[PDB]
Design a protein around this ligand. Structure first.
Ligand SMILES: [Ca+2]
Length: 314
């Protein structure tokens, strides 16, 4: 996947028994050369690195001091946590989208940081503040958080995003600015059809001519009382309709459940899906019932059945 490259390594062969610094919430992963990186929710966007994808070490943050412009969109934000980063690699540049918001409110903005490299040893390492991408106010019927970029088969970048309110949104990006045109249409592509509308954290991938929309249902952020689950649907066209195994549109609460956790891992969600060759991984967090509900990084091989639907195993 040109914009999420993982070399030749074979995820289905690897031992994904993670070790090290595994606290994480809302992760994404990128690999540049021999080094792997996690970005996740936390102060200034938290970063972890690994040599192998398995042993993780905490490594700094993107924004030591938050951009002044956040206050123009979310003036009541009073702490430095940035949420749900998303990484892609295009034209030599790393594009890191992220969320500026306050929990449970839809006064929100997605920002963009860019870097020439992910390696802080490189003289050109610098996370540049490239400003807002899309925002919501309290009279909008959507929430501008939880970005994900996908490039369709034809090379057009799209941004999906959303949490609660009318649900998951989709908008085209321009290839040079990596932002929507000012008159670009905003499409709604998934919704529980319930109030509150507990759907968020979209992630789209293409496999064999279908677009797969992964989302998280129900409630994060409650430790062992979290009810998060990972759901998926698919469409031949990136604008929908995304439908689940049963033929139900994701605009009507459709979605096939991929993981709802167990008595040890509570509330898995906020996922990402990456490929290397025909192998794939699912990345998410889950709340550790054996460690005070602390949110923990999970990376697992993601298999695909003979109808094209993803599944986990043991
Ligand atoms: Ca995400």
């Amino acid at each position: 996947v040109h914009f999420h490259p993982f070399g030749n390594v074979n995820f289905y062969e690897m031992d994904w028994s993670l070790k090290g610094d595994l606290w994480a919430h809302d992760p994404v992963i990128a690999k540049e050369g021999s080094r792997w990186y996690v970005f996740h929710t936390g102060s200034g966007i938290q970063i972890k690195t690994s040599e192998d994808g398995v042993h993780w070490e905490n490594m700094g943050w993107v924004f030591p001091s938050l951009p002044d412009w956040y206050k123009q969109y979310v003036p009541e934000k009073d702490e430095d946590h940035l949420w749900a980063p998303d990484i892609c690699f295009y034209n030599g540049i790393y594009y890191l989208y992220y969320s500026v918001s306050t929990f449970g409110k839809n006064t929100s903005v997605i920002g963009l940081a860019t870097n020439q490299t992910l390696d802080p040893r490189d003289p050109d390492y610098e996370w540049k503040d490239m400003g807002p991408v899309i925002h919501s106010t309290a009279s909008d019927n959507y929430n501008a958080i939880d970005p994900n970029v996908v490039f369709d088969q034809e090379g057009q970048p799209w941004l999906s995003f959303g949490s609660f309110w009318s649900g998951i949104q989709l908008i085209q990006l321009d290839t040079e600015t990596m932002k929507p045109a000012a008159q670009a249409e905003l499409l709604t592509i998934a919704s529980r059809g319930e109030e509150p509308n507990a759907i968020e954290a979209p992630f789209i991938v293409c496999r064999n001519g279908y677009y797969y929309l992964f989302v998280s249902f129900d409630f994060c952020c409650r430790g062992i009382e979290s009810t998060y689950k990972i759901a998926v649907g698919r469409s031949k066209d990136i604008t929908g309709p995304y439908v689940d195994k049963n033929g139900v549109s994701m605009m009507q609460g459709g979605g096939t459940i991929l993981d709802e956790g167990n008595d040890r891992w509570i509330g898995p969600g906020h996922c990402a899906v990456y490929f290397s060759g025909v192998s794939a991984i699912l990345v998410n967090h889950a709340y550790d019932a054996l460690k005070n509900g602390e949110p923990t990084l999970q990376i697992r091989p993601l298999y695909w059945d003979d109808e094209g639907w993803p599944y986990l195993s043991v």
